[PDB]
Design an enzyme around this catalytic site. Structure first.
Site, PDB file in Angstrom:
ATOM      1  N   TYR B  14       0.846  -1.188   0.000  1.00  0.00           N
ATOM      2  CA  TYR B  14       0.000   0.000   0.000  1.00  0.00           C
ATOM      3  C   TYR B  14       0.887   1.246   0.000  1.00  0.00           C
ATOM      4  O   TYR B  14       0.746   2.128  -0.852  1.00  0.00           O
ATOM      5  CB  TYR B  14      -0.871  -0.018   1.256  1.00  0.00           C
ATOM      6  N   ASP B  38     -11.601   8.106   4.039  1.00  0.00           N
ATOM      7  CA  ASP B  38     -10.483   9.049   3.916  1.00  0.00           C
ATOM      8  C   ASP B  38     -10.126   9.795   5.188  1.00  0.00           C
ATOM      9  O   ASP B  38      -8.951   9.927   5.540  1.00  0.00           O
ATOM     10  CB  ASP B  38     -10.783  10.073   2.818  1.00  0.00           C
TER      11      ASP B  38
HETATM   12  C1  LIG Z   1      -5.230  13.799   0.420  1.00  0.00           C
HETATM   13  C2  LIG Z   1      -3.680  13.859   0.846  1.00  0.00           C
HETATM   14  C3  LIG Z   1      -2.954  12.742  -0.012  1.00  0.00           C
HETATM   15  C4  LIG Z   1      -3.154  11.323   0.492  1.00  0.00           C
HETATM   16  C5  LIG Z   1      -3.485  10.964   1.984  1.00  0.00           C
HETATM   17  C6  LIG Z   1      -3.594  12.106   2.969  1.00  0.00           C
HETATM   18  C7  LIG Z   1      -3.902  11.846   4.351  1.00  0.00           C
HETATM   19  C8  LIG Z   1      -4.108  10.503   4.815  1.00  0.00           C
HETATM   20  C9  LIG Z   1      -4.003   9.384   3.896  1.00  0.00           C
HETATM   21  C10 LIG Z   1      -4.194   8.056   4.338  1.00  0.00           C
HETATM   22  C11 LIG Z   1      -4.080   6.975   3.399  1.00  0.00           C
HETATM   23  O1  LIG Z   1      -4.257   5.741   3.817  1.00  0.00           O
HETATM   24  C12 LIG Z   1      -3.785   7.174   2.034  1.00  0.00           C
HETATM   25  C13 LIG Z   1      -3.583   8.474   1.528  1.00  0.00           C
HETATM   26  C14 LIG Z   1      -3.680   9.622   2.419  1.00  0.00           C
HETATM   27  C15 LIG Z   1      -3.337  13.573   2.412  1.00  0.00           C
HETATM   28  C16 LIG Z   1      -4.075  14.792   3.030  1.00  0.00           C
HETATM   29  C17 LIG Z   1      -3.470  15.946   2.153  1.00  0.00           C
HETATM   30  C18 LIG Z   1      -3.248  15.299   0.770  1.00  0.00           C
HETATM   31  O2  LIG Z   1      -2.781  15.857  -0.245  1.00  0.00           O
END
Ligand SMILES: C[C@]12CCc3c(ccc4cc(O)ccc34)[C@@H]1CCC2=O
Ligand SMILES: C[C@]12CCc3c(ccc4cc(O)ccc34)[C@@H]1CCC2=O
EC number: 5.3.3.1
Lengths: 125, 125
Positions: B14, B38
């Protein structure tokens, strides 16, 4: 209400209480009908009496516990990485789990789950 | 089956996939009817299409992510502490969350939840 600041504070009180063997301090953090899942998979203990008994047995040995990273608190939830150290028969063990707390609107913990496996148990011979 | 070794391996795949912007590699880790939350509190996206779209948008910017501690894997579950770094308009941000994966018997991820709050977002001016 229940805020990240409050949840982080509860995590810190929790950690300091285990260190002090302060059983009343720990249970007081929980809702009367809360559940504690000592190790994932097992049957979650429920109710003040069950919760207190679990922590009572976990404190048979002197525990040294500390946060190893910042607490993660967001919308009624908190998760934290930490260590629980103890010694037995000349053997020092360090369990490194990640806990998860679910709070209610009152700021009380309604659900606690401790996540760790054999690979997270660091002990010598 | 599903073992701590397998869950830890999935966490590592991952992490490497986000780094490589390997979207197929990430989605392939999930069950067809999985859910991705998310940020806690929000509505969990469901289904391959929704999951892939979420990660697709999360990869708009180049991400540098790494585990900051050992993975915690036990009975169909895994939790891990890590960082996701990116830069925008000359500004470097580092988000430090804790994720939780729930697996099925096939070793696929049926549920992923990312836990972090404002205090876990480290950015300069
Ligand atoms: C969305 C993001 C990219 C990916 C990501 C974030 C935060 C927690 C995560 C947890 C995950 O398991 C996989 C990807 C993210 C970021 C917050 C700010 C940003 O650019
Ligand atoms: C039971 C135990 C003491 C307490 C404890 C352990 C593991 C995870 C925990 C998580 C908690 O949130 C609170 C207490 C413990 C240890 C496993 C070995 C041991 O002596």
């Amino acid at each position: 209400m229940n805020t990240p600041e409050h949840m982080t504070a509860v995590v810190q009180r929790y950690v300091a209480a285990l260190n002090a063997g302060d059983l009343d301090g720990i249970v007081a953090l929980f809702a009367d009908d809360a559940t504690v899942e000592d190790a994932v998979g097992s049957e979650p203990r429920s109710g003040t009496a069950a919760i207190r008994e679990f922590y009572a047995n976990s404190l048979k040995l002197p525990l040294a516990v500390e946060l190893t990273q910042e607490v993660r608190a967001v919308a009624n939830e908190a998760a934290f990485a930490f260590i629980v150290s103890f010694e037995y028969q000349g053997r020092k063990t360090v369990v490194a789990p990640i806990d998860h707390f679910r709070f209610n609107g009152a700021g009380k913990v309604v659900s606690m789950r401790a996540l760790f496996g054999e690979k997270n148990i660091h002990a010598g011979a």
